[PDB]
Amino acid sequence: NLNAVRETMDVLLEISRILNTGLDMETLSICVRLCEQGINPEALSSVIKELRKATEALK
Amino acid sequence: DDDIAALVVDNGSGMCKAGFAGDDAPRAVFPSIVGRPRKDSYVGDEAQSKRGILTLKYPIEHGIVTNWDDMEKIWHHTFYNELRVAPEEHPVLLTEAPLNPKANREKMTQIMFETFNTPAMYVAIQAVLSLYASGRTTGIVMDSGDGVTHTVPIYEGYALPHAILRLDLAGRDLTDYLMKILTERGYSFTTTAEREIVRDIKEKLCYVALDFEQEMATAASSSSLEKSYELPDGQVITIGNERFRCPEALFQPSFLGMESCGIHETTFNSIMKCDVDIRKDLYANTVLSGGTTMYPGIADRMQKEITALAPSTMKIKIIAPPERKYSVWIGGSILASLSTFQQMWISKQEYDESGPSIVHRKCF
Amino acid sequence: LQQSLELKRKMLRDKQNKKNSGQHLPIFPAWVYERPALIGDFALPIGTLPLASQESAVVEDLLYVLVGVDGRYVSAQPLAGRQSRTFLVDPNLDLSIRELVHRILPVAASYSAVTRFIEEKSSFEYGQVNHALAAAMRTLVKEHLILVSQLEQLHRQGLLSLQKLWFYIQPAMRTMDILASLATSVDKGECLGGSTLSLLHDRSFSYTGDSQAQELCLYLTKAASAPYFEVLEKWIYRGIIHDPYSEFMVEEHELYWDQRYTIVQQQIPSFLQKMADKILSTGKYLNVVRECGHDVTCPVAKEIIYTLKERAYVEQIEKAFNYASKVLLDFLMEEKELVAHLRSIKRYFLMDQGDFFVHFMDLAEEELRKPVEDITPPRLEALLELALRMSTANTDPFKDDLKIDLMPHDLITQLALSGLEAFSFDYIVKWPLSLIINRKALTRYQMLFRHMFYCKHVERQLCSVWISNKAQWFAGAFTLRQRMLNFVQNIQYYMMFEVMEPTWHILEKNLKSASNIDDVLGHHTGFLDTCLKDCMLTNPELLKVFSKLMSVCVMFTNCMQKFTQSMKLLVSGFEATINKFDKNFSAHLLDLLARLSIYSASVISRLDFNGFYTERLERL
Amino acid sequence: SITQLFDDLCEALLPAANRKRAKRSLKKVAYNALFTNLFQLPARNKILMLSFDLRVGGLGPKADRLEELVEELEAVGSVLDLLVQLAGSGPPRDYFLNNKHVGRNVPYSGYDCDDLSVFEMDVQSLISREECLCHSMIQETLQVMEAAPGTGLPTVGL
């Protein structure tokens, strides 16, 4: 079954690539397992955009 | 820590978890016992090792205080012996079990502000700390420990105590029923060391399968649930079937001899008493909690009963953590690091100017 | 100049023979070394020009001399191998300008031996640490050329002059003057591997608060640890290493456990000196278990980063050390066990079995009495197999290790004779267990067993002469028999009921409670050495009484009586020889106890058990 | 637990270069923004509006592929709801389309010559890159060749 849930997540990756998100492979695996707990994705949209900005203040 | 640090103290009935805020593990973990012989004045590992020349009492047994001397003594040995910090340089967050009366909170802060005199404190409930690790403000939390159990609905980050169902379950009652059934099977059991061995084998060796009926029939025809255990004491006891038959009080409560309802029936009647508009919202993030994660494997069966409860045309979004016994701890560990939590934190000025009852309104 | 050719020749020749992997080392083209035009460093009337023209012409010519080229006026006479640049200045230059020229030419002197470092020392033959050292002294010439370019733009507008130039090049004689010392120390003498990485740790104890030079030396040594971290990422976490150009502390060989890896003393850095032994031990433990099946990879293998001396990278070596020896020990003790193996050594050498010995002694008694080099080796393997499955010593799975041990010596191998004391057991040890327990152990076990064999041997003869003699009146050989049985019974009472079996029970837990092979090899060598040194076989004073005691025991039992020459069915002249044997035996026994007392206890304490002829005579 | 996975999300958007203690403090800004929403039409129509936004900007088969890929995604449901919120939050030919000299049973439509004009833009885009390169190499050196000396060197500034 782990081959099927792999191929569906691979299909999940490309449609977030042509919509030009900043999420990569590992951030998508994190976000999918976080949504599977029952975490509201409408707030995850805010925490990723704030974290990517505060990251640039360090560099 | 990373800013001005705080203190977190988890006053429970199975164990006392202490440490400074911003540490993901507790800086000290002691068992929940009082001194003064039945050491001279000590709480910890040494007091539990010398239980047979000391007394064992819990400060909060179900959410009521048995003795003011006992509660102040266990708090006093938490703050002064378990951690040894200065009260002026660290404010303390205290906890109370879900569904606890307001006067107990007043008596709690009355001890904390008189015996140690800190300039700031906080009193919180346990379910809000459990949910705040789960990164939400909404859910149903089923806490099942060794002296307390509550199915707590929590909506808007404020648990409504009118809709929390209180259930008295204790691990002492588990160990008691184990002693009765070992005597029914025929076994010498009259002292403390075999109580320690029997609690050890129920915490670590005991098995809980996903089905009750299949494994019981198979182990009744030929025990494949047994495994030989030869301790360093040199004592040999095993049976697989009976230790899996003992915690049946989760499904059918009359096996342990308890008078109140079983755990699935409890969350089922509780969600019957949840509002119909809030039912899907509480079910959208439902969490496992409680100390019964000491043997992992109980979780799959718990998720199965929660799936059988609510419909299956709704896709469950159940938050399933590996560890859920340090939930009260990790709540304060995240929470005191944020500066938004400091606006609900109570100072000494409001405690002296506006009485004790303001800690019920400002901290929650 | 010329030395570098010889240095390249010796380095390539040393690299080739030391390793066997096939040697085809790359060498960069010859024209880079022949020609000076891949290397950085390298008139008009002056008597008619006025002073302002002199300042402008000089500041231009100086801007040229700053890089590896010469200006319009001043040119360079040959360098030849000196590390400073010398020039043929234009005559009649002003004595006021000449001093500033002499302050600015030491900048070019500290550039000259920097381009010659990059253009020689980047090769693999000098070690692949100097490769990366000359790739981080490659950056500084880039900064140099950037500064020289901005000054020319200033000169075109008439806005460059001598004082401004002297201000701009004073940090350019404060970061490149640093290079003119380190560069002329690393080249001078051979420097490979970790010795250079300590040589750039030398001025981290000097410049830690300067911040002009401190950052430069830290930059240089963070760009020399990058190749060393690569081989450190192999040898620490797996037993495998690949060492291409000997940039590492441990010289890679291909011959096992004491034949493959050694630390060479000029490849070590200072901040791993305390932990060099731990590095060697870890890699050997991981390698020796990869041959006998199991996984080789360590779970922690996270990348290695530079910190000033204190362990945050010299930290993971301890979590490798506390994994490698313990997964190795946990493999060894339960799969091809050494704990049962030691018990099977104890089973035979320490004569735990009674089955094995009385079966083997009875079936081969005739052959055992026959002298050596009259013996037949296949007939002993015959009878040895006969004793094995006849006995209950046929129940261990390590029984096959016993072999015939013929030695035509009777402690002549120590620095003809009777066959029973020329027959021993050879117990072979397995090759995965050879790393801990070896041949040198088995020789000491053999000497213990020989010393023991003599005592059980004289007991059997005393006992047979006692039953064969029975008279009902005679008691004369009976008291002599009692007297020798006293000593040769009490010695092995004492030894294996006291010295060995409870201490062996302690040892069987102590080796399981060790943390590494080093602790096991310590405890075992202590026990074995001390328990052999306790015996009366050999001492620092040798105690020759014991040998003569055993010989006259043999004389009493068979070579005087011959079982009372079959009058068990002389003239009592043999009773006088019995009495003389008694006085000789008592004299030697008192000699042994007295010699033990004078040199600086138990055999004295229990022969005189409760005082039983505690006096018989005194010395003097 | 889940609190560790929020810090793993904090580790993903951080590229590797304090610097493990900046992480635990950015973890707080992640928690302070997680509870801002918590303080204060199915899935598939939201696919149709973005497919529309594509199809107005030309390039028809690309919308036809995005709908096919979300069709097997509708055959885990909570993560596409995140994907519709993030759109542009990241960084800011074959000869079988417009050719009839090849194919097997190739159809006929006559000339179009309104994609031949976007076949001149197919060259203008190549020219706009190789002119941007000659714009990005003369600027990166005029910014260093013009200043007072000691602006390209940190060691002169000490």
Swiss-Prot record, chain A:
Its main location: cytoplasm. It is found in: Cytoplasm, Cytoskeleton, Microtubule organizing center, Centrosome; Cytoplasm, Cytoskeleton, Spindle. Associates with the gamma-tubulin ring complex (gTuRC) consisting of TUBGCP2, TUBGCP3, TUBGCP4, TUBGCP5 and TUBGCP6 and gamma-tubulin TUBG1 or TUBG2; within the complex, interacts with TUBGCP3 and TUBGCP6 to form a luminal bridge with actin that stabilizes the initial structure during complex assembly. Interacts with TUBG1. Required for the recruitment and the assembly of the gamma-tubulin ring complex (gTuRC) at the centrosome. The gTuRC regulates the minus-end nucleation of alpha-beta tubulin heterodimers that grow into microtubule protafilaments, a critical step in centrosome duplication and spindle formation. It comes from Homo sapiens (Human). GO terms for biological process: gamma-tubulin complex localization; microtubule nucleation by interphase microtubule organizing center; mitotic spindle assembly. The keyword Acetylation applies. This is Mitotic-spindle organizing protein 1. Coiled coil: none annotated. Keywords: Acetylation, Cytoplasm, Cytoskeleton. The chain holds residues 17 to 75 of 82 of the full protein. One of its GO terms (cellular component) is gamma-tubulin ring complex. Belongs to the MOZART1 family.
Curated annotation (Swiss-Prot), chain C:
Its main location: cytoplasm. GO terms for biological process: brain development; cytoplasmic microtubule organization; meiotic cell cycle; microtubule nucleation; mitotic cell cycle; neuron migration; protein-containing complex assembly; spindle assembly. Changing A422P: In CDCBM15; uncertain significance. It is found in: Cytoplasm, Cytoskeleton, Microtubule organizing center, Centrosome. Keywords: Cytoplasm, Cytoskeleton, Disease variant, Epilepsy, Intellectual disability, Lissencephaly, Microtubule, Phosphoprotein. The keyword Phosphoprotein applies. Coiled coil: none annotated. Ubiquitously expressed. GO terms for cellular component: centrosome; ciliary basal body; cytoplasmic microtubule; cytosol; gamma-tubulin complex; membrane; microtubule organizing center; nucleoplasm. GO terms for molecular function: gamma-tubulin binding. Component of the gamma-tubulin ring complex (gTuRC) consisting of TUBGCP2, TUBGCP3, TUBGCP4, TUBGCP5 and TUBGCP6 and gamma-tubulin TUBG1 or TUBG2. TUBGCP2, TUBGCP3, TUBGCP4, TUBGCP5 and TUBGCP6 assemble in a 5:5:2:1:1 stoichiometry; each is associated with a gamma-tubulin, thereby arranging 14 gamma-tubulins in a helical manner. Gamma-tubulin at the first position is blocked by TUBGCP3 at the last position, allowing 13 protafilaments to grow into a microtubule. Component of the gamma-tubulin ring complex (gTuRC) which mediates microtubule nucleation. The gTuRC regulates the minus-end nucleation of alpha-beta tubulin heterodimers that grow into microtubule protafilaments, a critical step in centrosome duplication and spindle formation. Plays a role in neuronal migration. Belongs to the TUBGCP family. This is Gamma-tubulin complex component 2. It comes from Homo sapiens. The gene is TUBGCP2.
UniProtKB/Swiss-Prot annotation, chain D:
It is linked to Microcephaly and chorioretinopathy, autosomal recessive, 1: A syndrome characterized by microcephaly, cognitive impairment, underdeveloped retina and choroid, and epilepsy in some patients. The more anterior parts of the retina, near the periphery and pars plana, have a grayish hue and diminutive vasculature similar to retinopathy of prematurity. Visual impairment becomes evident during the first year of life. Component of the gamma-tubulin ring complex (gTuRC) which mediates microtubule nucleation. The gTuRC regulates the minus-end nucleation of alpha-beta tubulin heterodimers that grow into microtubule protafilaments, a critical step in centrosome duplication and spindle formation. This is Gamma-tubulin complex component 6. Component of the gamma-tubulin ring complex (gTuRC) consisting of TUBGCP2, TUBGCP3, TUBGCP4, TUBGCP5 and TUBGCP6 and gamma-tubulin TUBG1 or TUBG2. TUBGCP2, TUBGCP3, TUBGCP4, TUBGCP5 and TUBGCP6 assemble in a 5:5:2:1:1 stoichiometry; each is associated with a gamma-tubulin, thereby arranging 14 gamma-tubulins in a helical manner. Gamma-tubulin at the first position is blocked by TUBGCP3 at the last position, allowing 13 protafilaments to grow into a microtubule. Belongs to the TUBGCP family. It is found in: Cytoplasm, Cytoskeleton, Microtubule organizing center, Centrosome. It comes from Homo sapiens (Human).
